[PDB]
Amino acid sequence: IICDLIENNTNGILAMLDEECLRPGTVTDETFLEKLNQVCATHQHFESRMSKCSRFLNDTTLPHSCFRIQHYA
Amino acid sequence: DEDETTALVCDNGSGLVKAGFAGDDAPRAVFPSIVGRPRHQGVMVGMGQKDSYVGDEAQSKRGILTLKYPIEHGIITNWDDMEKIWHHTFYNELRVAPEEHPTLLTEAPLNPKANREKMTQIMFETFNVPAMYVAIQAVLSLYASGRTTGIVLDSGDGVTHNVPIYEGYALPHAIMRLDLAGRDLTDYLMKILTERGYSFVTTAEREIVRDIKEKLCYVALDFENEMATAASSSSLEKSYELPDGQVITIGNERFRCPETLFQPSFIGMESAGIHETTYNSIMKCDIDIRKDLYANNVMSGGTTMYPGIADRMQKEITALAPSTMKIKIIAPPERKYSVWIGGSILASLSTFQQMWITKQEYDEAGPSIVHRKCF
Amino acid sequence: DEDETTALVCDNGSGLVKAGFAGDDAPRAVFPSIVGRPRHQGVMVGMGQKDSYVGDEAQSKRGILTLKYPIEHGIITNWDDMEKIWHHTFYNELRVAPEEHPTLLTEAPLNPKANREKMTQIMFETFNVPAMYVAIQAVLSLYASGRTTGIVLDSGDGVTHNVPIYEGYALPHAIMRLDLAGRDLTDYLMKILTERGYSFVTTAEREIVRDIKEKLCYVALDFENEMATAASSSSLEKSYELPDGQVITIGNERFRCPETLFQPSFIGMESAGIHETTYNSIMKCDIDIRKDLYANNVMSGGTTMYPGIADRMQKEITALAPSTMKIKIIAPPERKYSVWIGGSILASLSTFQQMWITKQEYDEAGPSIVHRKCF
Amino acid sequence: DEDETTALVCDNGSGLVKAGFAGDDAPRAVFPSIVGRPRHQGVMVGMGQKDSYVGDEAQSKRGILTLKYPIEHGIITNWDDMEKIWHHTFYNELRVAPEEHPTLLTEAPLNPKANREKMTQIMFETFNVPAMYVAIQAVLSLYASGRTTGIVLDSGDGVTHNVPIYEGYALPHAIMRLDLAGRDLTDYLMKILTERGYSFVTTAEREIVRDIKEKLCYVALDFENEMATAASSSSLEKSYELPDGQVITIGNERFRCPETLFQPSFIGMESAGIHETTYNSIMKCDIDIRKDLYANNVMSGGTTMYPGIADRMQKEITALAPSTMKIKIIAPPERKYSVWIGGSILASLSTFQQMWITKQEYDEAGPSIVHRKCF
Ligand SMILES: Nc1ncnc2c1ncn2[C@@H]1O[C@H](COP(=O)(O)OP(=O)(O)O)[C@@H](O)[C@H]1O
Ligand SMILES: Nc1ncnc2c1ncn2[C@@H]1O[C@H](COP(=O)(O)OP(=O)(O)O)[C@@H](O)[C@H]1O
Ligand SMILES: Nc1ncnc2c1ncn2[C@@H]1O[C@H](COP(=O)(O)OP(=O)(O)O)[C@@H](O)[C@H]1O
Ligand SMILES: [Mg+2]
Ligand SMILES: [Mg+2]
Ligand SMILES: [Mg+2]
């Protein structure tokens, strides 16, 4: 499930960052993190504060301009 | 977040959400209360377009959005949109968790009951605040005024209201509420700019007309003398560069726009005007209060940031009041935030800390608990 | 064939078929969209003469052929000939099987419905592609432009069109389509070369005049100053060697040929011109968009490869636009392929891969599926 | 000329000049408000070619002219061309001297000030009329309606506007102006006919599309039911023979063309629609007026000559209005002239004869005299 979250050609994080390096316009780190908040919200193992389905919104231990991945460690 | 659990004050009055922590002299978050939704198709793939933009971001992207104020005349009309406004208020602008901070909401007097009840319901059930308190906005303006005796008007974006208070005691039979404020002056300015030849009808163009109102309008002292002065020559005619284009040149509209606030027959509203509802709010009090009201007439809120509204106000009330009375229009430059600032002073009081409406008693009694413990 | 199943981009706009694979910076197949058929008897026995020659081979053998463009003004008019163009595109130039590659077709905005419907029908039924997507050509030019905000014109061989886009959102009420492009400039150049004394009327000689247009024509900045300059002396007069013969010497026709693109009354077309349809396409947008359009005026397609068309474009639009606006004509040297290149960038997006129109749903819905899923 | 000095009524609204004498039930001169100028060289010597053709003659000779409407969205934009329209109105169509007849001009509400001022200047200074009066057009529609109580919309060629009137008293704070009318529906019909495959871009071809709109378009009651009905079969598909050529066959465009008048997002105009600006114009009135407005909803002007617009109008407003209200859409077959006809009734009143703006007081006060004596 974890590898898929990074590997997938249509919503994986490397595919989204490959797209962000490809797609035109204003490309920052903030817009990439907002894209990860858009296309990885309904994933179980993705964890960010500004995710749309977030149960880690009131988690004060998550700084903005960051995100968590639920690795095995 | 915050280093402390200091209480929040969220003044969301009718058209400009301003919020911050208690003990501050100024709100840390000031943004317009708009929700913009796109009305055109998204043709660029993978850009990062959202479903709806809130506040200042919707003010930036307003060329491709439609702008909806979720609160009109002090009454919240779109609760899901207002939930977006509050979510953007705590989590995006303040970047704080509302579960750790008490919140101080402001309403207008003589409001609907389901406004404060459902606002209490969304504060406790959706955002899970530990304690809340909804308070009348002009009373808070008298807190930042530094007085316990005076009659107050604030004139927000949707509602103006007089609250006379004597020696700390509210006079709720003499509270005046007039639903004539800055959004109505924006619409009337759209009408008279249409009269000159500039057609603004779009909600983004409505915000342009709001910026014209904020930057170029002023209150005349004698409306017929300034009216005949503008009819005489081009002395008071001032030009404004539109966003992304040409330059307009407006004349008498500078003082015909806020004169509606003194003469509500311009927008067709049968009422007495802001000076005569102030005077009638004084005369509906007891007699031995009245001079202390005249010496402490407080004009300390929103829309009344026009140039020359204190001179017009003192002229009209001094014309209405009897002689040998000292009429003093308290109009600080701390306006447009003093309703919030007195929210900070009220939240920072030690003896106020029993008057918060917490959990457990909201959870005992339900959303009518404000009608127990708020005024 | 191809080592991967990478999607194809086949820009077949109106007069020059250019196609390749996604992820490439340049199309692998560029050939003119002509179908030549012999008009003379074959007298040599057993040579290997064909029924019709397609593209570059028809451009070589044009002395004994008649040349028919199967697509005119962006509208396909000979579907069997266009089937020969596509068959030559996939099987001869690219040498690939279309059953394994998705294809990205380009059209012009405000096109006939049966164009995209029957083009979809030939893509799925004749060539059996797994997925297709027909997209508006100037939007693709804004993909290769690297911007999500700007107004675009491409000016192909049959159609020029302005598409203004703000923050990724299309403005389809402000899309301008002008049917004045390089083939009309070729015909007008045939007329004014007939004025000088060189009579070109054959379709092969029409291609010679097209080569004169590509090699010797340029856009004047002031048409009367360059006109009186050519009337003054032989300073700008330039000579061209014809295919297989004599040398011609052309003068003011160098700038009278593309000035028709700015003044369409030369070819008798009642319209506003390319600069004034650009300006009117800006003014039909919302107001707070407009400066971002002026700073991102994109001129990134076909016919606009003339020398000095960006200076004339910025001169005319800067003359039309109000002052204190920054008018920036984005005209890269990546033109004449950037509509394809943005086709490659759009096909190479990860989130685009759900927007392909596949089988099974074309097979569910029929050829109106593009009017569901294409813009 | 005229046997009497009976006052003229010249309704020149935005796209169709109709004029006549007072006391008539119908205007004696109806012609389109176009000015056509030749764009081609005159090669036949001594024929009798003019510099510009006006009105019906320009409608006949439109194949070799360019057609310019001198008035757009109710606002006059070419004053010399509009001077040709008025000169043709009095001297050619009516064949009368304007120095002997008072004239009753019509404008739209919420118009530019220099429109009525400069229109007054051309009426008194160029044509030398003895008296004039500029009046709001929907008020005149309520004169021919036979009522002193009702809300009116006319929908001309450039502007639709609601004027609610109760017991003879105007409600000018509740006047709605929407700049969406028949010329915009003509342009949108040009776009969707371009979608089907028929490319009309010429101003003469624009008049052909206007004739298609007048002859074949109708307002659907449920847009999705008629939309799926046209998607089902060829039941509602109707054919039209073009001027001087082939036969076109149009389908859903019959009801997609005027549905823009109810859904202005089709042409990209952010507004509420004609039914919701009617309802909002009712709700911006005082409360004890409102049922009398619902029982006297007057739809009595121009563009609203579509089949089935009264049923759609009563459906949408009855859906918006509360229950137990009688919604009555007054839509006579006297439409497209009733704004003129109420001009004749207003000019034929005895007590109106002091309200004319004459000479000598225009000559005393200048062109602001309308802002003294017109509404
Ligand atoms: N400098 C100014 N001059 C005139 N009007 C102003 C000025 N600044 C703001 N306004 C008007 O006052 C409104 C802000 O009122 P405010 O009291 O902030 O509303 P709220 O009750 O939501 O706090 C704005 O909508 C604007 O129309
Ligand atoms: N160097 C050039 N200068 C002038 N005109 C050119 C030049 N190159 C191409 N053209 C014209 O532009 C046309 C091709 O335009 P293009 O954008 O490639 O259209 P397509 O949509 O078919 O891809 C050519 O057929 C020719 O008329
Ligand atoms: N039968 C009809 N069906 C649909 N539209 C019509 C019809 N008759 C006229 N129109 C539209 O109404 C316009 C004329 O409106 P009118 O009120 O005469 O304009 P004006 O305000 O200039 O007098 C025409 O441009 C036409 O588009
Ligand atoms: Mg306030
Ligand atoms: Mg192309
Ligand atoms: Mg009219």
Could you give a quick summary of the protein structure above?
The structure is cut from a larger assembly and holds one copy of chain A (73 residues) and three copies of chain B (375 residues). Chain A is mainly alpha-helical and 73 residues long. Chain A is built from three helices and two strands; from the N terminus they run αααββ.
Q: What is the share of helical residues of chain A?
A: 25-40%
- The domain tally of chain B reads 4
CATH superfamily of the largest domain in chain B: ATPase, nucleotide binding domain
Report the C-alpha radius of gyration of chain B, rounded.
21 Å
Shape of chain B: flat
Secondary-structure content class of chain A: mainly alpha
Helix percentage range of chain B:
25-40%
Question: What summary fits the major beta sheet of chain A?
Answer: 2 strands, antiparallel
Instruction: Please identify, by name, the CATH architecture of the largest domain in chain B.
Output: 2-Layer Sandwich
**CATH topology heading of the largest domain in chain B:** Nucleotidyltransferase, domain 5
Please trace the helix and strand order of chain A, writing H or E for each element: HHHEE
* CATH class category name of the largest domain in chain B: Alpha Beta
- Please count the beta strands of chain A (DSSP E, at least 2 residues each): 2
Structural class label of chain B: alpha+beta
Q: What is the topology?
A:
This is part of a larger assembly, with 1 copy of chain A (about 70 residues) and 3 copies of chain B (about 375 residues).
Chain A: H1 2-7, H2 13-22, H3 29-39, E1 46-47, E2 68-69
Antiparallel strand pairs in A: 1-2
Chain B: E1 8-11, E2 16-21, E3 29-32, E4 35-38, E5 53-54, H1 56-60, E6 65-68, E7 71-72, E8 75-76, H2 79-93, E9 103-107, H3 113-125, E10 131-136, H4 137-144, E11 150-153, E12 160-166, E13 169-170, E14 176-178, H5 182-196, H6 203-216, H7 223-232, E15 238-241, E16 247-250, H8 253-262, H9 274-283, H10 290-295, E17 297-299, H11 309-320, E18 329-330, H12 338-347, E19 357-358, H13 362-365, H14 369-373
Parallel strand pairs in B: 1-9, 9-10, 11-17, 17-18
Antiparallel strand pairs in B: 1-2, 2-3, 4-5, 4-6, 7-8, 10-19, 11-12, 12-13, 12-14, 15-16
Helix pairs in contact in B: 4-12, 5-6, 5-8, 9-11
